[PDB]
């Protein structure tokens, strides 16, 4: 079983978005009004699931093939790849990376999406993989389209892919969103702008990666992820 053998650097909750960001309207009633209670790290917080023994299907990381209903999806073929490291720069191997997204026209395959843009019969919008022994992950997909939504009267999400990353403990687990280099919707989005620091926003922008492209086939984007730094315990209980 798991052991308490490390500590994780405390989060900067001014680098992360705060809970109450009223321009993102749904945050108003879904943000605590009392302060978070700080607690010291114990085995409950410094351990978490490892997914090395989860059974992955052959196409779980390949959204061009994992919802195959007679053909290929319509849209901009792209590889999305990167490295997961911690704040000390150490790779995070064998960690679970999950992603979900709309199709090329901004339509989600979800029962609650009422946007008029059509579903793509060959696109589902879900991927997962494990980082390799050096911390690298890779997905193949189509670039999602921007998504209008009922926030302000003319609000549109930039093109984006939702990400979840487990990391070594429940203290490191993170959900975030990837945006695409140059997208003019990024500075206008109230969800992006839930992050107060512009340098933090830049950390969510994936860069065009021509080096990783397959000529005559697909482009590529690179999105590196940084989880909380992990260190050994020291000088405790004395």
């Amino acid at each position: 079983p798991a052991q308490d053998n490390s500590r994780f650097v405390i989060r900067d909750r001014n680098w992360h978005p705060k809970a109450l960001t009223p321009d993102y309207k749904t945050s108003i009633a879904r943000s605590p009004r009392q302060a978070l209670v700080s607690i010291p790290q114990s085995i409950s917080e410094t351990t978490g699931p490892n997914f090395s023994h989860l059974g992955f299907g052959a196409h779980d990381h390949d959204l061009l093939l994992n919802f195959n209903n007679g053909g290929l999806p319509i849209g901009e073929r792209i590889i999305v790849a990167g490295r997961v490291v911690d704040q000390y720069g150490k790779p995070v191997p064998n960690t679970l990376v999950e992603m979900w997204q709309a199709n090329a026209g901004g339509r989600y395959r979800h029962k609650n999406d009422r946007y008029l843009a059509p579903l793509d019969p060959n696109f589902g919008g879900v991927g997962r993989c494990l980082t390799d022994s050096d911390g690298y992950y890779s997905f193949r997909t189509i670039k999602p389209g921007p998504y209008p939504w009922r926030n302000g009267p003319n609000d549109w999400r930039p093109a984006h892919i939702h990400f979840g990353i487990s990391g070594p403990s429940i203290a490191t687990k993170l959900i975030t969103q990837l945006y695409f280099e140059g997208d003019p919707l990024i500075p206008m989005c109230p969800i992006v702008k839930s992050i107060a620091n512009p340098e933090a926003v830049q950390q969510l922008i994936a860069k065009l990666d021509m080096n990783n492209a397959n000529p005559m086939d697909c482009l590529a984007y690179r999105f590196d992820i940084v989880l909380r730094g992990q260190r050994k315990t020291h000088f405790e209980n004395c």
Partner: protein, 200 residues
């Protein structure tokens, strides 16, 4: 001062989180293996229990699109981190509220006692992380049990909550669902009865 690489910032999971993390709930086909809400095979050691709850916003309305991750010790106080659908017990699981009733469920065993880093026993607890549309960074809490009053009163984590009235928000209520032992743990994100949320 020493400044490390900044952590990637959080963003909301959004209301279509189910596409990625709760496929059946999205209305979609599932893969051969999914991480979900049945932590214990029938023959896992310990007391088999159902956990259930609803999630409320600051106006007292159900948060029907919430997604929860849980992490708990097994009945013997051991964290089983080698996730595997063939395990008798997994310490990790996922659940989500139904869209009609706003209710999530978890099938598990009552966790055994684990010590904190100073060697002091913590009362039996489930660690919970809550995600949803409108939640920019997930909310951490703990589910404790109302039939562990003696242990709860001595828990070094519950005791870090300054007001006893706020400690009460973390105590799940024993009940019965379909005649089986259950505990209900409602979460109030904001306002009257606001659930304690942790930073660590």
């Amino acid at each position: 001062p020493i400044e490390l690489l900044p952590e990637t910032p959080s963003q909301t999971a959004g209301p279509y989180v189910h596409i990625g993390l709760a496929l059946e709930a999205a209305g979609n086909p599932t893969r051969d293996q999914e991480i979900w809400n049945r932590l214990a095979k029938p023959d896992a050691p310990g007391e088999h229990i159902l956990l259930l709850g609803q999630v409320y916003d600051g106006n007292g309305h159900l948060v029907r699109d919430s997604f929860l991750e849980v992490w708990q010790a097994d009945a013997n106080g051991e964290y089983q981190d080698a996730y595997n659908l063939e395990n008798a017990f997994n310490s990790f699981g996922r659940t989500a509220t139904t869209f009609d009733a706003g209710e999530w469920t978890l099938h598990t065993v009552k966790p055994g006692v684990v010590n904190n880093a100073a060697g002091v026993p913590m009362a039996p607890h489930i660690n919970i992380s809550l995600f949803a549309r409108g939640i920019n960074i997930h909310l951490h809490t703990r589910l404790y049990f109302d039939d562990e009053a003696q242990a709860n009163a001595k828990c070094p984590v519950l005791n870090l909550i300054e007001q006893p009235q706020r400690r009460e928000t973390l105590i799940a209520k024993r009940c019965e669902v379909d005649g089986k032992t259950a505990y209900r743990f409602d979460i109030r994100i904001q306002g009257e009865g606001e659930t304690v949320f942790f930073d660590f």
